[PDB]
PDB file of C-alpha atoms in Angstrom:
ATOM      1  CA  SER A1385     -10.716  38.739 120.898  1.00 19.23           C
ATOM      2  CA  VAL A1386     -14.166  38.084 119.443  1.00 17.22           C
ATOM      3  CA  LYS A1387     -14.163  39.073 115.765  1.00 15.47           C
ATOM      4  CA  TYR A1388     -17.258  40.741 114.322  1.00 11.65           C
ATOM      5  CA  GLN A1389     -18.224  41.403 110.709  1.00 12.61           C
ATOM      6  CA  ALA A1390     -21.126  43.804 110.388  1.00 12.49           C
ATOM      7  CA  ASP A1391     -23.279  44.970 107.522  1.00  9.65           C
ATOM      8  CA  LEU A1392     -25.543  47.899 108.280  1.00  8.70           C
ATOM      9  CA  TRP A1393     -28.266  49.275 106.023  1.00 12.46           C
ATOM     10  CA  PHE A1394     -28.832  53.047 106.223  1.00 13.06           C
ATOM     11  CA  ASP A1395     -31.064  55.665 104.684  1.00 13.19           C
ATOM     12  CA  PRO A1396     -29.274  59.040 104.782  1.00 14.08           C
ATOM     13  CA  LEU A1397     -32.529  60.715 105.898  1.00 11.25           C
ATOM     14  CA  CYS A1398     -33.111  58.412 108.885  1.00 10.42           C
ATOM     15  CA  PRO A1399     -32.148  59.849 112.313  1.00  9.69           C
ATOM     16  CA  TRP A1400     -32.015  56.358 113.857  1.00  9.45           C
ATOM     17  CA  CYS A1401     -29.778  54.822 111.215  1.00  9.21           C
ATOM     18  CA  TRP A1402     -27.577  57.848 111.839  1.00  9.45           C
ATOM     19  CA  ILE A1403     -27.227  57.465 115.582  1.00  8.83           C
ATOM     20  CA  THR A1404     -26.824  53.708 115.398  1.00  9.28           C
ATOM     21  CA  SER A1405     -24.328  53.979 112.528  1.00 11.02           C
ATOM     22  CA  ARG A1406     -22.296  56.547 114.556  1.00 13.76           C
ATOM     23  CA  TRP A1407     -22.484  54.208 117.550  1.00 12.61           C
ATOM     24  CA  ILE A1408     -21.117  51.256 115.571  1.00 14.57           C
ATOM     25  CA  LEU A1409     -18.233  53.464 114.351  1.00 16.06           C
ATOM     26  CA  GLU A1410     -17.572  54.225 118.037  1.00 16.71           C
ATOM     27  CA  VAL A1411     -17.676  50.462 118.621  1.00 16.93           C
ATOM     28  CA  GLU A1412     -15.014  49.979 115.920  1.00 16.66           C
ATOM     29  CA  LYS A1413     -12.525  51.793 118.135  1.00 18.63           C
ATOM     30  CA  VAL A1414     -13.051  49.703 121.270  1.00 18.81           C
ATOM     31  CA  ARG A1415     -13.973  46.299 119.792  1.00 19.88           C
ATOM     32  CA  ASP A1416     -12.645  44.071 117.006  1.00 18.92           C
ATOM     33  CA  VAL A1417     -15.472  45.148 114.694  1.00 19.90           C
ATOM     34  CA  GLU A1418     -15.498  45.609 110.923  1.00 24.22           C
ATOM     35  CA  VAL A1419     -18.395  47.656 109.529  1.00 24.44           C
ATOM     36  CA  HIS A1420     -19.651  47.651 105.944  1.00 26.39           C
ATOM     37  CA  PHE A1421     -22.426  50.025 104.918  1.00 25.72           C
ATOM     38  CA  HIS A1422     -25.223  49.487 102.403  1.00 26.00           C
ATOM     39  CA  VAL A1423     -27.720  52.062 101.305  1.00 25.11           C
ATOM     40  CA  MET A1424     -31.470  51.603 101.475  1.00 23.98           C
ATOM     41  CA  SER A1425     -34.391  53.933 100.783  1.00 24.21           C
ATOM     42  CA  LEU A1426     -37.141  53.993 103.412  1.00 24.30           C
ATOM     43  CA  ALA A1427     -39.376  55.794 100.888  1.00 23.99           C
ATOM     44  CA  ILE A1428     -38.977  52.925  98.443  1.00 23.81           C
ATOM     45  CA  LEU A1429     -39.516  50.325 101.175  1.00 24.35           C
ATOM     46  CA  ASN A1430     -42.848  51.865 102.160  1.00 23.20           C
ATOM     47  CA  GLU A1431     -43.806  52.288  98.498  1.00 23.44           C
ATOM     48  CA  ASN A1432     -45.986  49.193  98.919  1.00 23.45           C
ATOM     49  CA  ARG A1433     -47.836  50.449 101.994  1.00 24.60           C
ATOM     50  CA  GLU A1434     -50.997  52.325 101.012  1.00 24.72           C
ATOM     51  CA  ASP A1435     -51.672  55.371 103.180  1.00 28.20           C
ATOM     52  CA  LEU A1436     -53.397  57.874 100.891  1.00 28.11           C
ATOM     53  CA  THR A1437     -53.342  60.681 103.506  1.00 25.49           C
ATOM     54  CA  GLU A1438     -49.529  60.853 103.338  1.00 26.88           C
ATOM     55  CA  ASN A1439     -49.336  61.250  99.537  1.00 25.26           C
ATOM     56  CA  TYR A1440     -49.531  65.068  99.492  1.00 26.13           C
ATOM     57  CA  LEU A1441     -46.349  65.216 101.561  1.00 26.86           C
ATOM     58  CA  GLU A1442     -44.083  62.504 100.171  1.00 28.47           C
ATOM     59  CA  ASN A1443     -44.179  63.968  96.680  1.00 26.94           C
ATOM     60  CA  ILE A1444     -42.828  67.348  97.820  1.00 27.27           C
ATOM     61  CA  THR A1445     -40.478  65.742 100.353  1.00 25.09           C
ATOM     62  CA  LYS A1446     -38.470  63.865  97.715  1.00 21.80           C
ATOM     63  CA  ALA A1447     -37.272  61.498 100.464  1.00 21.82           C
ATOM     64  CA  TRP A1448     -35.970  59.093  97.819  1.00 22.63           C
ATOM     65  CA  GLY A1449     -33.412  61.696  96.707  1.00 23.69           C
ATOM     66  CA  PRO A1450     -30.385  61.179  98.981  1.00 24.70           C
ATOM     67  CA  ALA A1451     -30.551  57.354  98.831  1.00 23.97           C
ATOM     68  CA  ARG A1452     -30.645  57.548  95.030  1.00 24.06           C
ATOM     69  CA  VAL A1453     -27.547  59.694  94.840  1.00 24.11           C
ATOM     70  CA  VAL A1454     -25.626  57.559  97.282  1.00 24.82           C
ATOM     71  CA  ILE A1455     -26.355  54.309  95.444  1.00 24.23           C
ATOM     72  CA  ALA A1456     -25.533  56.004  92.132  1.00 24.74           C
ATOM     73  CA  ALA A1457     -22.257  57.051  93.737  1.00 23.49           C
ATOM     74  CA  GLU A1458     -21.520  53.501  94.850  1.00 21.81           C
ATOM     75  CA  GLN A1459     -22.177  52.077  91.383  1.00 21.28           C
ATOM     76  CA  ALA A1460     -19.612  54.477  89.938  1.00 24.12           C
ATOM     77  CA  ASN A1461     -16.965  54.156  92.659  1.00 23.50           C
ATOM     78  CA  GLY A1462     -17.717  51.031  94.710  1.00 21.90           C
ATOM     79  CA  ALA A1463     -18.430  50.719  98.445  1.00 20.89           C
ATOM     80  CA  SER A1464     -15.437  52.777  99.562  1.00 18.83           C
ATOM     81  CA  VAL A1465     -17.476  55.866  98.801  1.00 17.35           C
ATOM     82  CA  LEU A1466     -20.415  55.055 101.105  1.00 17.95           C
ATOM     83  CA  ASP A1467     -18.883  55.945 104.462  1.00 16.10           C
ATOM     84  CA  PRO A1468     -17.426  59.336 103.487  1.00 17.29           C
ATOM     85  CA  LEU A1469     -20.533  60.331 101.487  1.00 16.43           C
ATOM     86  CA  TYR A1470     -22.898  59.205 104.267  1.00 19.31           C
ATOM     87  CA  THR A1471     -20.987  61.058 106.956  1.00 21.72           C
ATOM     88  CA  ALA A1472     -20.973  64.253 104.841  1.00 21.74           C
ATOM     89  CA  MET A1473     -24.728  64.040 104.285  1.00 22.72           C
ATOM     90  CA  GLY A1474     -25.594  62.934 107.795  1.00 21.39           C
ATOM     91  CA  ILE A1475     -23.655  65.667 109.570  1.00 21.40           C
ATOM     92  CA  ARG A1476     -25.747  68.141 107.562  1.00 18.77           C
ATOM     93  CA  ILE A1477     -29.162  66.490 107.711  1.00 20.80           C
ATOM     94  CA  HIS A1478     -28.887  65.484 111.342  1.00 20.18           C
ATOM     95  CA  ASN A1479     -26.209  67.267 113.394  1.00 20.27           C
ATOM     96  CA  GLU A1480     -26.873  70.580 111.650  1.00 18.60           C
ATOM     97  CA  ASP A1481     -30.598  70.044 110.895  1.00 22.52           C
ATOM     98  CA  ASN A1482     -30.221  70.911 107.199  1.00 23.78           C
ATOM     99  CA  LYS A1483     -33.420  69.846 105.444  1.00 24.24           C
ATOM    100  CA  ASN A1484     -32.581  71.460 102.112  1.00 25.20           C
ATOM    101  CA  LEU A1485     -31.687  68.171 100.444  1.00 27.37           C
ATOM    102  CA  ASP A1486     -30.599  69.762  97.142  1.00 26.02           C
ATOM    103  CA  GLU A1487     -28.028  71.650  99.200  1.00 23.31           C
ATOM    104  CA  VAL A1488     -27.048  68.635 101.299  1.00 21.49           C
ATOM    105  CA  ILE A1489     -26.565  66.504  98.191  1.00 20.55           C
ATOM    106  CA  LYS A1490     -24.700  69.192  96.241  1.00 24.40           C
ATOM    107  CA  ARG A1491     -22.327  70.022  99.096  1.00 19.46           C
ATOM    108  CA  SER A1492     -21.755  66.394 100.157  1.00 23.15           C
ATOM    109  CA  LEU A1493     -20.849  65.245  96.635  1.00 23.45           C
ATOM    110  CA  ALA A1494     -18.384  68.142  96.452  1.00 23.23           C
ATOM    111  CA  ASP A1495     -16.871  67.407  99.893  1.00 22.81           C
ATOM    112  CA  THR A1496     -16.162  63.870  98.694  1.00 22.80           C
ATOM    113  CA  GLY A1497     -14.730  64.746  95.266  1.00 21.17           C
ATOM    114  CA  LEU A1498     -17.560  63.080  93.356  1.00 23.79           C
ATOM    115  CA  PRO A1499     -18.908  64.497  90.083  1.00 23.58           C
ATOM    116  CA  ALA A1500     -21.590  67.181  90.580  1.00 24.97           C
ATOM    117  CA  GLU A1501     -23.603  65.367  87.911  1.00 20.80           C
ATOM    118  CA  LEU A1502     -24.481  62.554  90.386  1.00 19.06           C
ATOM    119  CA  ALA A1503     -26.945  64.976  92.040  1.00 18.95           C
ATOM    120  CA  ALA A1504     -29.318  64.448  89.102  1.00 18.61           C
ATOM    121  CA  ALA A1505     -29.896  60.851  90.299  1.00 23.08           C
ATOM    122  CA  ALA A1506     -32.217  62.225  92.993  1.00 25.39           C
ATOM    123  CA  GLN A1507     -34.776  62.980  90.279  1.00 26.10           C
ATOM    124  CA  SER A1508     -34.193  59.774  88.321  1.00 23.09           C
ATOM    125  CA  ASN A1509     -35.854  56.440  88.992  1.00 21.68           C
ATOM    126  CA  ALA A1510     -33.093  54.514  87.200  1.00 21.90           C
ATOM    127  CA  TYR A1511     -31.511  53.243  90.443  1.00 23.26           C
ATOM    128  CA  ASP A1512     -34.735  52.300  92.174  1.00 26.41           C
ATOM    129  CA  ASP A1513     -34.413  48.624  91.238  1.00 24.76           C
ATOM    130  CA  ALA A1514     -30.849  48.578  92.546  1.00 23.23           C
ATOM    131  CA  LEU A1515     -32.258  50.013  95.775  1.00 21.50           C
ATOM    132  CA  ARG A1516     -34.992  47.361  95.942  1.00 22.05           C
ATOM    133  CA  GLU A1517     -32.246  44.800  95.430  1.00 22.73           C
ATOM    134  CA  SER A1518     -30.311  46.245  98.344  1.00 24.29           C
ATOM    135  CA  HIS A1519     -33.508  45.920 100.408  1.00 27.25           C
ATOM    136  CA  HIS A1520     -34.009  42.221  99.678  1.00 22.08           C
ATOM    137  CA  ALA A1521     -30.380  41.691 100.694  1.00 24.90           C
ATOM    138  CA  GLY A1522     -30.782  43.460 104.044  1.00 25.70           C
ATOM    139  CA  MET A1523     -34.390  42.584 104.939  1.00 28.74           C
ATOM    140  CA  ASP A1524     -35.788  39.149 105.741  1.00 27.62           C
ATOM    141  CA  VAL A1525     -38.378  47.053 108.289  1.00 29.54           C
ATOM    142  CA  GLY A1526     -35.670  48.123 110.720  1.00 31.80           C
ATOM    143  CA  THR A1527     -33.950  51.452 111.265  1.00 28.10           C
ATOM    144  CA  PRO A1528     -31.254  50.448 110.962  1.00 24.86           C
ATOM    145  CA  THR A1529     -31.024  46.844 109.815  1.00 26.76           C
ATOM    146  CA  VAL A1530     -27.829  45.096 110.863  1.00 28.81           C
ATOM    147  CA  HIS A1531     -26.287  41.737 110.012  1.00 29.55           C
ATOM    148  CA  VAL A1532     -23.507  40.645 112.330  1.00 30.38           C
ATOM    149  CA  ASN A1533     -21.712  37.305 112.188  1.00 27.66           C
ATOM    150  CA  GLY A1534     -24.505  35.510 110.352  1.00 30.49           C
ATOM    151  CA  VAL A1535     -27.397  36.888 112.424  1.00 30.41           C
ATOM    152  CA  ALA A1536     -29.720  39.801 111.655  1.00 36.02           C
ATOM    153  CA  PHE A1537     -31.468  42.372 113.826  1.00 34.13           C
ATOM    154  CA  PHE A1538     -33.305  45.683 113.811  1.00 35.99           C
ATOM    155  CA  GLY A1539     -31.720  48.394 115.926  1.00 37.38           C
ATOM    156  CA  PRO A1540     -30.549  48.884 118.550  1.00 36.98           C
ATOM    157  CA  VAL A1541     -32.751  51.944 118.504  1.00 38.30           C
ATOM    158  CA  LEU A1542     -30.783  54.558 120.443  1.00 40.07           C
ATOM    159  CA  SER A1543     -31.802  58.200 121.032  1.00 39.82           C
ATOM    160  CA  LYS A1544     -28.243  59.279 121.756  1.00 42.55           C
ATOM    161  CA  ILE A1545     -24.820  58.191 120.500  1.00 40.13           C
ATOM    162  CA  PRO A1546     -22.882  56.174 123.125  1.00 38.31           C
ATOM    163  CA  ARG A1547     -19.129  56.796 123.072  1.00 38.93           C
ATOM    164  CA  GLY A1548     -15.983  54.800 123.816  1.00 38.02           C
ATOM    165  CA  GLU A1549     -16.215  51.873 126.216  1.00 38.79           C
ATOM    166  CA  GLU A1550     -19.862  52.584 126.965  1.00 42.64           C
ATOM    167  CA  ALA A1551     -20.530  52.083 123.261  1.00 43.54           C
ATOM    168  CA  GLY A1552     -18.646  48.797 123.459  1.00 41.14           C
ATOM    169  CA  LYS A1553     -20.436  47.476 126.546  1.00 41.50           C
ATOM    170  CA  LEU A1554     -23.720  48.066 124.716  1.00 44.18           C
ATOM    171  CA  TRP A1555     -22.322  46.262 121.699  1.00 43.70           C
ATOM    172  CA  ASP A1556     -21.429  43.266 123.861  1.00 42.30           C
ATOM    173  CA  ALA A1557     -24.942  43.194 125.353  1.00 46.12           C
ATOM    174  CA  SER A1558     -26.698  43.713 122.028  1.00 44.86           C
ATOM    175  CA  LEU A1559     -24.772  40.898 120.397  1.00 45.71           C
ATOM    176  CA  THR A1560     -25.353  38.541 123.312  1.00 45.51           C
ATOM    177  CA  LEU A1561     -29.094  38.823 122.748  1.00 47.01           C
ATOM    178  CA  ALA A1562     -28.744  38.726 118.954  1.00 48.30           C
ATOM    179  CA  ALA A1563     -26.498  35.657 119.058  1.00 49.81           C
ATOM    180  CA  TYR A1564     -29.273  33.771 120.872  1.00 51.91           C
ATOM    181  CA  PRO A1565     -31.318  32.281 118.010  1.00 52.71           C
ATOM    182  CA  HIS A1566     -34.470  32.235 120.147  1.00 50.29           C
ATOM    183  CA  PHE A1567     -34.317  35.910 121.094  1.00 49.04           C
ATOM    184  CA  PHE A1568     -36.790  38.120 119.283  1.00 47.28           C
ATOM    185  CA  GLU A1569     -37.421  41.391 121.128  1.00 44.91           C
ATOM    186  CA  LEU A1570     -36.616  43.832 123.936  1.00 43.68           C
ATOM    187  CA  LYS A1571     -38.351  47.220 123.833  1.00 44.75           C
ATOM    188  CA  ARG A1572     -39.996  50.093 125.652  1.00 44.91           C
ATOM    189  CA  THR A1573     -41.887  53.163 124.436  1.00 45.29           C
ATOM    190  CA  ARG A1574     -39.559  55.806 123.068  1.00 46.35           C
ATOM    191  CA  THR A1575     -39.772  58.940 125.224  1.00 47.62           C
ATOM    192  CA  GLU A1576     -36.969  61.027 123.691  1.00 48.11           C
ATOM    193  CA  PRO A1577     -36.266  62.687 120.369  1.00 49.58           C
ATOM    194  CA  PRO A1578     -33.002  61.662 118.700  1.00 47.88           C
ATOM    195  CA  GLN A1579     -30.052  63.765 119.910  1.00 50.21           C
ATOM    196  CA  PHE A1580     -26.862  63.978 117.845  1.00 50.58           C
ATOM    197  CA  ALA A1581     -24.128  65.483 120.044  1.00 50.47           C
TER     198      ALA A1581
END
């Protein structure tokens, strides 16, 4: 009987955004929770950070690609397209460990009935400012970043997807802490890789 309105920022490539986004969709089924997704690029966020030793890799990784396509998709079809397109990408990138992003993008656009042409946005910088705009909206960096009922938080960082009522009980606890304006942090060292089953 407590109503929640949630906005969650995701990068299709991010394993943590994926788990936590799947968790909140589990929460939707056992709590009065409405979820609205927004796309971010982690590659664009860290564009400002200067670590020269990582440059060789980022430029062949093309980590900006999926986020660019998804925001290009949204611009052409509105927000209704985010959830199906994200799920189609995420199942591939994460559940199935498919790191051929050209393939993931091509197949996910097709699965969702979007024009194949949108795949070209991966190589274009024309949506980067839109993406930076999305970042300013969500951030004031967390994986994922979540606004619920007027308050913002990073996480919860989960290494596995909680299901059903367990997912809900963790929602209740997370939001109790988040709703307290003088709460800032609860953490421990991460000892597990993300698992997607």
